[PDB]
Copies of this chain bind each other. A is one copy, B any other.
Amino acid sequence: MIRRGDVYLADLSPVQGSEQGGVRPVVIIQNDTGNKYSPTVIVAAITGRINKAKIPTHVEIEKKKYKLDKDSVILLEQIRTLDKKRLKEKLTYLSDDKMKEVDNALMISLGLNAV
């Protein structure tokens, strides 16, 4: 079952310019009716390139709790609809508190900030 808050390995290549590419973890951010009843998910990329949030659309995740190669950052400015066939293995699942920070950074990202 694909749940919002799941983190999967996914090949994001090919990409252009500053789009995040590579085989990497991504977190599911699509609502759960969409995850269940549609062939696509929306995800946010995760990078181990940095371990500290630089901007308010970044959210940190710790390797000790989440089974990643490295302390990492979720990039809510790099979001994409992905076909489900791009999801490889299921790495982890984020806590409810981690998902609140994600909800926040995503509202800032999309200017929904006027809640």
Interface residues of A (CB under 8 A from B): 4, 14, 16-20, 29-32, 34, 38-40, 42, 57, 77-86, 103, 106-113, 115
Contact = CB atoms under 8 A, between A and B. Distances in A.
Given A40-B78, A77-B30, A77-B34, A17 B84 contact: yes
Nearest to A16: B83
A86 B86 CA distance: 23
Given A14-B14, A40-B19, A31 B81 contact: no
Nearest to A32: B111
Looking at A30, A86, A107, A112, the one whose CB has the most chain B CB atoms below 10 A away is A112
Given A14-B14, A18-B40, A34-B57, A29 B110 contact: yes
B111 A29 contact: yes
Contacts of A30: 77, 109-111
